[PDB]
Amino acid sequence: VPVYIYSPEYVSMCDSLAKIPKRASMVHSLIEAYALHKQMRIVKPKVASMEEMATFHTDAYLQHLQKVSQEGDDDHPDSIEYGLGYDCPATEGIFDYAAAIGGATITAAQCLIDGMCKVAINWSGGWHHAKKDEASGFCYLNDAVLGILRLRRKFERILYVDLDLHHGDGVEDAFSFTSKVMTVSLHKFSPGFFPGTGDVSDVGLGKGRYYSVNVPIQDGIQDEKYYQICESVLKEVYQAFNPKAVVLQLGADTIAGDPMCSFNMTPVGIGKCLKYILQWQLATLILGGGGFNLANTARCWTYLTGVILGKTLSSEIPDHEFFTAYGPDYVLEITPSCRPDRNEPHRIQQILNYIKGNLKHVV
Amino acid sequence: RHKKX
Ligand SMILES: [K+]
Ligand SMILES: [K+]
Ligand SMILES: [Zn+2]
């Protein structure tokens, strides 16, 4: 049975993030509305200690974050250098919110290490852009990195797969010099698009050369092509790297209807990627991430919880607290937008062939 | 540095 990281206090904390208000409550409430919590093991998240956070993040950064958090000082002169600002405002309590999420992802990882489950879920995690000494991209603390480091206590090789719209740069950079963690990110890569890194030529550094895989994708990609790409890369990665555990970031900012309006995916296409990873039958840590159409993010992660459970869910959205957010259709399915796929078969083939060549080196 | 957002 999957572990579901959840408490009422946790969700309420996660609801207060500035760029996704109420999202955690919408997600949890939809999953509950589908009765899926009755098929999972609910685990209260432990808050991350300063020591656990400092295995990745600098004390100076954490100390500054905790400082501005006390009263929500969004005007502190040092904040710019620590990445706090427009994307990452210093909201009152943000240190507590970020320690809670870090703690939730560590807890999930610990359940995995203890053999409590094969699948552990923290839909409020996946804040993949944070650097050791810098907030970035709505991320204040890199819970993914913290979860990966925790898994490294037991599991010899960790694969991180990042299906968020944006390049998982914080996680890649944290592990760019090691061969013990392989990072794989599929993302939009176009000059001017955040965070501006992760071209197919970025493969990591030193001993970690070839242990970073980047798949730059253009606007308008749909389920079928995305899965073809993902399966092709993951097939090769799996043979080459032989992971003992997986951390999977499933940001829903790829899904049609997202205000970012870049990719054109549905939850079913992402679910095929998820299904492919789950059949490896490795310890798997599931994270959320982006997702700025709040109802669609809940539709996505609810459907994906369903595929983790091997259930097909009713197409009718059940009555619940946020029912009205699901109009005008009130169904779980998401229809792709009618706009061009900007991905040319030839460019995709060059990218995949380049990646295949890089992975030949991974011994 | 880029904006996100
Ligand atoms: K990504
Ligand atoms: K690496
Ligand atoms: Zn994103």
XYZ file of N, CA, C and O in Angstrom, chain A residues 80 87 134 137 194, chain B, unseen atoms left out:
38
model
N 18.085 39.918 -1.762
C 18.385 39.806 -3.186
C 19.431 38.722 -3.463
O 19.254 37.923 -4.373
N 9.805 36.376 -7.303
C 9.473 34.937 -7.366
C 9.347 34.309 -5.988
O 8.428 33.525 -5.746
N 20.459 29.745 -1.993
C 19.585 30.608 -2.775
C 18.214 30.019 -3.015
O 18.083 28.908 -3.519
N 12.690 30.354 -8.074
C 11.609 29.725 -8.812
C 10.494 29.207 -7.944
O 9.959 28.153 -8.194
N 12.374 30.376 -17.968
C 12.985 30.019 -16.695
C 13.307 28.527 -16.623
O 12.481 27.712 -17.072
N 20.539 34.957 -13.859
C 19.223 35.056 -13.203
C 18.024 35.317 -14.149
O 18.054 36.201 -14.999
N 16.961 34.539 -13.964
C 15.699 34.685 -14.682
C 14.537 34.773 -13.660
O 14.672 34.320 -12.527
N 13.458 35.475 -13.977
C 12.087 35.256 -13.575
C 11.301 34.079 -14.054
O 11.400 33.721 -15.212
N 10.392 33.534 -13.275
C 9.714 32.262 -13.288
C 8.273 32.742 -13.391
O 7.571 32.242 -14.279
N 7.858 33.734 -12.575
C 6.586 34.272 -12.503
